[model samples]
Target: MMYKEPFGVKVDFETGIIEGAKKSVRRLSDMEGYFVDERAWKELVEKEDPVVYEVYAVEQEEKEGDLNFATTVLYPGKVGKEFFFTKGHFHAKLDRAEVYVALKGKGGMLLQTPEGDAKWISMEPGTVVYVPPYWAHRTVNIGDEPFIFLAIYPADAGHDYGTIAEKGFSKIVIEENGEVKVVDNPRW
Candidate 1:
């Protein structure tokens, strides 16, 4: 038997603000482990509850398929000068690939291998990024506004976040003297 479902959903792709999205927020409080500056993390904890980013996901229907899709909106803000970003992950099945299409704002797609090599791709409205298998990836909001993008990947590509949780990306993006800087993560 084949699995199938009615396909009738639509997305704006512009604002990525879907009417019935499953909403989630990444607060400054939740990112204590990822920041490069201990002082910045402590300061944010004492200051207030600040939402660094928001995700509006229109999850794919459960079915047997080669891919599933989602849309994400990464709000603009920073922990000190470091930009807000996704937790980032590699697929459980390391041979699976993913694709991202930028819908709004500007950002950077940071990719790293399990062995620690790292690279980045610039993201802006209309930019499309192809993420090959064997890389862990994250999205950083490099601009002053929220960044939105559509992501498509193998439905069975289960996320492996623990790898990053244990040893984060090889590098991190931060602002220094009003310029974006990609520096090696001292924590990694």
Candidate 2:
């Protein structure tokens, strides 16, 4: 739990390509005393496999103040693992309100409303989560270290909100006498 690295500014690199060393921008005080030892980073994310790496870093754009922002760092136990059930999505113009603070371990945050019904939330470590604006969310870290959080969306351009329609974001392929169905379901 090495701290420091809090004072934002440019962090873009993902669709709005900005190369200078192949997309760069850092400063959360330059990741301050940068350090990560969450139990060897969750055993290096459980020996990495299945999805090769669910999300090493999925950044869309960055500069959340005057606009231009989209970031994701889902990472956590059993992450997606060949797609382990993930659904619920919405955000039509991104009404401005999205915060999740956990910085480490323990989780569960589900919000549904696209006519599906579901709401379950439980997070630890200075918990603080809020999402308002065509709500329909998803989050499950169930603890074990590496439940870091930070997803702040909204950087419009004629209204290009993050991901606007997702219901039962499915993905599953479990066979070997384990029982787990569902193949694929995606709709950006």
- lDDT (Cα atoms) of all candidates against the true structure: 0.84, 0.41
lDDT of 2 by residue, 119-146 (tens): 6666676677886665666665443344
The per-prediction tally of clashing pairs is 0, 2
Q: Give the runs in model 1 whose Cα sits over 4 Å from its true position.
A: 1-3, 60-64
Per-model TM-score, in order, reads 0.90, 0.23
Model 2 misplaced stretches (Cα beyond 4 Å) = 1-87, 94-137, 142-146, 155-166, 172-188
Task: Report how far off residue 10 is in candidate 1 (Å).
Answer: 2.7
Q: What is the lDDT of residue 98 in candidate 1?
A: 91
Task: Give per-residue CA lDDT, model 1, range 1-188, as digits (tens).
Answer: 97657575577876786667687777878776777777987887788757777776656543345567778888887888889899899988887889999999999899988798999999989999999999999999999888999888887888898888777899999999989999888777
Considering summed lDDT, which 10 consecutive residues are worst modelled in model 1? 57-66
How high is the lDDT of residue 107 in model 1? 98
Q: Worst ten-residue run, lDDT, model 2?
A: 27-36
